[PDB]
Amino acid sequence: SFPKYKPSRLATLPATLDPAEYDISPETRKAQAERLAIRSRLKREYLLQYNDPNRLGVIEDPALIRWTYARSANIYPNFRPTPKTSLLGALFGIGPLFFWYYVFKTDRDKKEKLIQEGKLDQTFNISY
Amino acid sequence: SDAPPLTLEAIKDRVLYVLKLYDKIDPEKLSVNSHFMKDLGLDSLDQVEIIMAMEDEFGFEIPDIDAEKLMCPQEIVDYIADKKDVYE
Amino acid sequence: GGVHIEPRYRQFPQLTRSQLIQAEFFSATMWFWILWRFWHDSDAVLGHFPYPDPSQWTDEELGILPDDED
Amino acid sequence: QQERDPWYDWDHPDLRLNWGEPIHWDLDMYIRNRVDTSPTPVSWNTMCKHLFGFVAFMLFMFWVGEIYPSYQPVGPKQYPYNDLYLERGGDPTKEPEPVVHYEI
Amino acid sequence: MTLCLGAITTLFTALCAITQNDIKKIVAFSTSSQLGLMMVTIGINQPHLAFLHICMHAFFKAMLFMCSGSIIHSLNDEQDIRKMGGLYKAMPFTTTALIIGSLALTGMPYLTGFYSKDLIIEAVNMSYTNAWALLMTLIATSLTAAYSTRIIFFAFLGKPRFPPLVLINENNPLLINSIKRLLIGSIFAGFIISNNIPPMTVPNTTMPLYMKMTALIVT
Amino acid sequence: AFSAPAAYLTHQQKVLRLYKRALRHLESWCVHRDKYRYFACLMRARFDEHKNEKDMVKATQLLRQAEEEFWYGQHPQPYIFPESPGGTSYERYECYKVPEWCLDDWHPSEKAMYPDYFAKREQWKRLRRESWEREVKQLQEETPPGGPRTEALPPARKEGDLPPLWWHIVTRPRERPM
Amino acid sequence: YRHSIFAVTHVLIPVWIIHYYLKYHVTAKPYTVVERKPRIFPGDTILETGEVIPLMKEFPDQH
Amino acid sequence: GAHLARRYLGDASKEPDPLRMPTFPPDYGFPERKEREMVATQQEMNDAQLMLQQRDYCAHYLIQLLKCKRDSFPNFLACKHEQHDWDYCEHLDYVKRMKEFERERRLLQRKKRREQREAEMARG
Amino acid sequence: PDSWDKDVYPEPPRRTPAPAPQTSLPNPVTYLTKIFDLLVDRPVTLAREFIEQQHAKNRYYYYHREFRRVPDITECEEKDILCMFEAEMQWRRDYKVDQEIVNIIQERLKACQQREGESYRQNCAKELEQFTQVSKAFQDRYSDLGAHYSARKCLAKQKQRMLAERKAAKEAAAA
Amino acid sequence: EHGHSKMELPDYKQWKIEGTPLETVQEKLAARGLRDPWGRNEAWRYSGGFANNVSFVGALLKGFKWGFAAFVVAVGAEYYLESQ
Amino acid sequence: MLKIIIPTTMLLPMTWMSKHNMIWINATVHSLLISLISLSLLNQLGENSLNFSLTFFSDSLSAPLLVLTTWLLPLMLMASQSHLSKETTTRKKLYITMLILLQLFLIMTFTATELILFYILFEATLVPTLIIITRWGNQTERLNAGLYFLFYTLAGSLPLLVALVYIQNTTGSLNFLIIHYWSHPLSNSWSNIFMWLACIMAFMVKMPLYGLHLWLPKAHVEAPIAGSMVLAAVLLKLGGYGMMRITTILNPLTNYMAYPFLMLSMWGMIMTSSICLRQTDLKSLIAYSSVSHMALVIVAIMIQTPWSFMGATALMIAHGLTSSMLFCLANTNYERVHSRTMILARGLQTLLPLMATWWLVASLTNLALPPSINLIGELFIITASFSWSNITIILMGMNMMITALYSLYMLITTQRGKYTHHINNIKPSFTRENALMALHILPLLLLTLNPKMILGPLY
């Protein structure tokens, strides 16, 4: 009996504290086998391409290209106008603008009123 | 730094020196090719304790995946020599 | 720049008497300076001027009349 | 990517990535030079609570100390020439209301 | 604001230093606490005293860091206080230099840290300040003494804990001269500077006996 | 690092790893050597109480409470070796490691210096050139259908053969190149 | 000899250049170099005028 | 502290307020009320340009100390008598301030007791 | 030095104390200043004498440019572009001159603050007042004109100020 | 010129648990029925020049004797010179 | 001004009648000579201007831009030498002809005594850039990018022309001197509001304003190196110069109408600097940095104070130089790796130390390290905005922090760390690239000695 550990988004659960690894089953073992099989196939291909004395360039990585394309050029064709996207876009693209407009307009109206009333003490304020 | 460059003679001497201080191992029966589990009758926990002793004596820690498959003093000497790039 | 000193492997390292006498000299001069300053200017630690007791003062010089005048 | 295996023989040891494996959508956010999600010896909520409590207690006690200051049993310091009027601000043509200091 | 910021900074940094295992991290939190004390001095309207503390801290903190670096280089790039043990006799010059530096840092009387830090505490005792800020300054002084004790004890007093191959060496003229110049500095410069500069603040001539010495009992 | 990882960790490997981690963190807690020896032998005794244990179910019930107890008292600032993945000098000299192919870009005036070294380099290049042609066929014949099930490579089985994919293992820059 | 050459070519020449620049060009323009006025205490004599600043009020000396 | 404890746990109005001192007339104690004397005149006390907070009633001793420190410069340990005299004058100023503080404390005590006695007499 | 005007840049007589050594211990400052003089000032002075005689061997002059006055924007027809151009250039030159006047006053104030040491708050009240008046005048003349300032905008600002002043004075007189 | 002269190792028979705090450790495990198999290996940490320890106060007072001697000599000289 | 215009035109017959192997040398030498000649325009007066003739006039706002435009062409030729090696002589001469025409159009644009001629050349600069982007572009999206870079600009510039001629029907002249001298206030009316919008949004598009900046990452990524340098250095400053020229007629309506654009530029810089933090492409990151800097310039121009104009001019010059250098460095990496991805090629300091030093200096200038002219412009704009309103300092400080963050992120991702193992075709830097970086960076550190030459007419 000890105080327990609570995982969070920025503090993930340790591997040793994951009960899922202790629920060992034959299909889990086969899944790990095929996972390491595909990893070994990729490693073998990369090592074959990497140790070649005739290759004098850059080993093009399909995964990096896929990552860059999905991040940059695959966004709009998959975009769909949904209520979530609509409200999120409207908020994050309009709200800050109107908030800053309100703040600056209030400040400048206050300053202009103070100037017109003459109670500002703008002495030595030559450079503007 | 100023550290002297160690040789495999030094590595083997230090490994055997550490193993002889292990009272669970009779100093006369131990050799550079003497296996730990069969020739010396040591458990797995004794092997991991030996690996920890080598780590403390040499100042670097061997990864566990590589550590569990070090069964002879010569294997430890060779692994350390490959790690530290020892010529002669 | 210095002299050659070899490793020892589980015994005490080789020490030159030069560093020993230098360290002892500097510790001795630190303690001598501390004692000399404590002797010559002791008011820096234990003070020089006494702290008067506020209650020890009498009512004559504190401007107090016996509760009847003003 | 900080919590990946550091002893594995990665193709990109600094990045800790392998050639051909799928790349996380947010890889450039976890690159060992930025936010890392490695487990901590203490639960995140506990550290949050402790830090917030410490900061709040310090601020509250600073406010209390401002409310209840510490000082010595002395009066205000006395300055000779009308509380040093001429050399603090100037204005010599007004003849300020004079104050004189009580010798005790 | 400056007084409160300095007080919280010095308190928190000393408290963090009180239990660190890296020597360099300990000295870093020490210098952060000293900067917090400097900011506290600024907050009580004593600028020249803060400048004097800057000048003395330069000497003794730089020499402390050089001693730590000498130890680190001696033991083959090791910084955790769990792995340097008995170095009082293994390295005598580094030991005595670090001892003198820790004494000056803690405001041992008539050293370079005395002439600044004791005046800092004396001024903070009799100013219209926060009670909390004064309390945290006193606790920071106590924690400074405590972490100096931690460094000396864990690095010089017990039995050795470094790897068997002893490579401890000190006989290099560059290191010896560089350490000794700042040793002479941290010994005598406090007195020399304090007695050479013109008086730039009103002295605290009269004090209660307990309030005059409170830094000593705290340390 | 040198050994290719297996598909999984067996129970024995997990117990050994937990034992080593517990000993290391206990050493971190117990600074002095005699106290560490006493408590480490106590840990060994408490660890071998169920060494001769029989069934896997409650043995896996164990080594699970042990993980929680270790994580509760894991010394949040453990000792780390200087060159370990958390040490103060983990990747200090990675800025000094220059690949060998850079030497091919050297000016002929630079290669006039160190001529014997470049002669040996040419010999090594020729040896790699022939050995690669042998190695590719050896790997092709040896590998099972569907590719390797593990990232473990076979050794050389003939007289003049060299281990497959050896160039970028033996030509590591150095541990401390400068 | 090395230290003599060092002091000649690393201290003397820069100080010559700086002194020439300050004394003949920087000080040519007004208000470029402004000095804090030296402190005047009772009993001091001034070189240019020669008068004597009077002493103090003869305060009662005790302890 | 003891005064802090007395003021912050006892009656607040029983103890003086440092931000409002003095709260009583200066002739309220005795009618003589001798006046403090400043030795240094404005001209010499400005020509030495000590400091704006060093310009107190102890300025003459500070002027003497500065005079020596300028005069006997290489031997920085030459003069201690003027430093001692300046410290003594500052000590005297501090004890005068403490006298003022205690005077106001006991004057407030007397005023409070007089008011309480008057209220008791009115009640009876 | 006659390189600048003493009336434009006033300086106090610079009274300095005389040495009054109370000890027989020789100071290092005097010896250091003597050796510095001997090794630095003499070679520098000789080089300057050589350079000055070389300059005196070949003497030639340069002159300050004088600008005549022209009709300003107030006496300028509404659409007469030529007189508007002349008045505009005159106004820009006057603006530059006023900027340099403010610069001179600011330099006076800075020199006063540095020279007076610790009694600057009292001994620089005259310079502070002078700078206050000059800054007030400059702010009235040229502030709030904008990036595209012109003589017409300055004239309009002045006219608005005079309207306000006249209205206020009329109200005060008839109250 | 470096440290290359073939430094020799000591003999492993030199390290004995005798005279070290490892006796206490061995006795405390023996009360429970246990032995430390690596106790001898660490004996070198208590064998040679490491056999003596200095207290914190002793370390602080590293050069107190010579300093006090010089201080009293200087004080005596000052007294004998001023009272002339 | 014909002494600069005629040699630039004569560069065309010299290019076309040169040897098959001597075109680059001739073009570089004569472009450098023309830049040396154009350096004489830096002598300005505190009075109105340098009125050469009825058609062309010069000012201390036009002179630095003209000098930079003349100076950029030799750098563009040096950068374009490499990737055009396998091109036929006719097409190389066509590329040089496009660059020469672009320089000529910019040179005639920056004098432009009349607003209609300014508009004509300002829109004429669109054709050579479009051809350069859409013809000698490596990737397939160039065509798409070209369309963007076209239509956006025209969508902003077509109304302006209308407004321009409308002004001539009401005032009778578009000559800048008469427009300045005969200026009258703009009353608050819907007609005047739309006239203001038509006169402003033409230059707000090409700056570019946040929300109208979408064409810029596309055009900068898909253009060749020389197109990128000419787009980032000079073609972005056309909007700022046009705004400075045309704001003299929009008063006092500018004070009322600046808010929608001030809000978009003040919040826009934060958004673009944040976008720079998460970018897998070097060229896109540099483009968004350009967007942030030009948003700050927009704020400065809209504030309309002398310090604002000085800061805007200095920032325009410094940003042009720094962005050109950054694009050149990224192109030197791309010519080796052929990828244009930040994370793939790493640890290049250990392989190319001098190029790493160039990267460090370029990032330091982009980070606005004092006393560089970048920081002079930024500080002047910040002070002017603080005078405008005291709350703006929050946004400016946030932008400064994020700018330093992403600049050092650029430096660390590419130069520091461990090199990519499987990349072995990283040859030592040629003398051409090193000379290109030196010629980019030395003018910046020389202009920091005489800041008054790039501070504009309000100095």
Ligand SMILES: CCCCCCCC/C=C\CCCCCCCC(=O)O[C@H](COC(=O)CCCCCCC/C=C/CCCCCCCC)COP(=O)(O)OCCN
């Ligand atoms: C990439 C996108 C950028 C494109 C921006 C385009 C918007 C520019 C602003 C509107 C363009 C046309 C404005 C008219 C040009 C000015 C000419 C002028 O001043 O004449 C006006 C004419 O005013 C107009 O005709 C305005 C009518 C506008 C009709 C078309 C409206 C287009 C959309 C306007 C709303 C959007 C505003 C912001 C633009 C957002 C684009 C992102 C005066 O009328 P008079 O006939 O002379 O009468 C005087 C006697 N009473």
Ligand SMILES: *OP(=O)(O)OCC(C)(C)[C@@H](O)C(=O)NCCC(=O)NCCSC(=O)CCCCCCCCCCC
């Ligand atoms: O023969 P070997 O290959 O050496 O295998 C060793 C062993 C026999 C133990 C193993 O292979 C085996 O077969 N075990 C059978 C059952 C078993 O051991 N089950 C696990 C027992 S759990 C346990 O030992 C409790 C540990 C509690 C202590 C935790 C440490 C906490 C430290 C806190 C920080 C200091």
